[PDB]
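Thread amino acids onto this structure.
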């Protein structure tokens, strides 16, 4: 069992680091190209993650009261958006300079964030099937990345509370008849891959940010703790990939809109209801 993120996937920062130096950026990119997953430690201040964790746990009762609680694949992996109230929208989270340095270098200067969502993994949750969150664009074709998932754990993720299983290097795999309509990986391909490059799972401390290819094979797993495990999730896409805009209150337009760290946003006059 791993006690920490593996050194080969990890770059250590502080919240004062606003850019990676050239050698660190090169390493970040080499990790993403080879392994499809990069763990950045020490990115976000406690003040921010505390507030986001508290807001998501406070919203959970409303989410659980809905008629059909929306889940990712199997019981206990609840889809839950974080609030888009002005007081909980932070430049260092939505427009993190290190994250965008990386996504600009991989996806281009006009890459844009188009997801502001989350995954609440409840106590007693089930095992998800191995899947990709975003598909390859044509079957049987090798092509470069068009999207990067930016995952923000809001508590310490442990082997006990449902730290995600990742399949390193799987982001480039796209043989024929590999994926079903839900993005789940066909069992024959899973087992062939396992023999060559087995999956890994490891603790990730709150304050970290995980950047990964949207095509990376992974699965959520059971949370065997007594506490819900919140993840905040964003996804950067090439400018040409069609996505609906993120609904944001126009009280953040001044700093969101016109930044060179792009967001595909629609700005609204009221407060936005993130939950319904
Ligand atoms: Ni997933």
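Threaded sequence (276 positions):
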């Amino acid at each position: 069992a791993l006690a920490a993120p593996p050194g080969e996937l990890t770059l250590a920062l502080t919240p004062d680091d606003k850019t990676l130096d050239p050698a660190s950026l090169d390493r970040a990119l080499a990790i993403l190209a080879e392994h499809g997953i990069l763990v950045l430690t020490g990115m976000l201040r406690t003040r921010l993650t505390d507030q986001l964790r508290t807001a998501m746990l406070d919203d959970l009762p409303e989410v659980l009261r809905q008629q059909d609680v929306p889940t990712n694949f199997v019981p206990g992996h609840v889809q839950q958006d974080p609030p888009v109230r002005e007081s909980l929208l932070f430049p260092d989270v939505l427009l993190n300079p290190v994250v965008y340095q990386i996504t600009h270098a991989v996806l281009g200067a006009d890459a844009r964030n188009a997801v502001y969502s989350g995954n609440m993994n409840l106590p007693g949750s089930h095992e998800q099937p191995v899947h990709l969150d975003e598909p390859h664009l044509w079957p049987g074709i090798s092509h470069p990345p068009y999207c990067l998932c930016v995952d923000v754990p809001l508590i310490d993720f442990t082997l006990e509370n449902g730290s995600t299983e990742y399949w390193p290097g799987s982001h480039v795999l796209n043989p024929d008849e590999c994926y079903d309509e839900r993005g789940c990986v066909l069992p024959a391909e899973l087992e062939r891959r396992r023999a060559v490059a087995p999956p890994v799972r490891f603790p990730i401390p709150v304050g970290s940010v995980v950047i990964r290819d949207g095509r990376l094979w992974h699965r959520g797993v059971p949370n065997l703790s007594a506490a819900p495990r919140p993840l905040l999730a964003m996804t950067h896409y090439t400018e040409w990939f069609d996505m609906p805009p993120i609904q944001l209150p126009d009280t953040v337009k001044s700093w969101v809109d016109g930044s060179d760290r792009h967001t595909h946003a629609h700005f609204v006059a009221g407060d936005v209801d993130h939950l319904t």
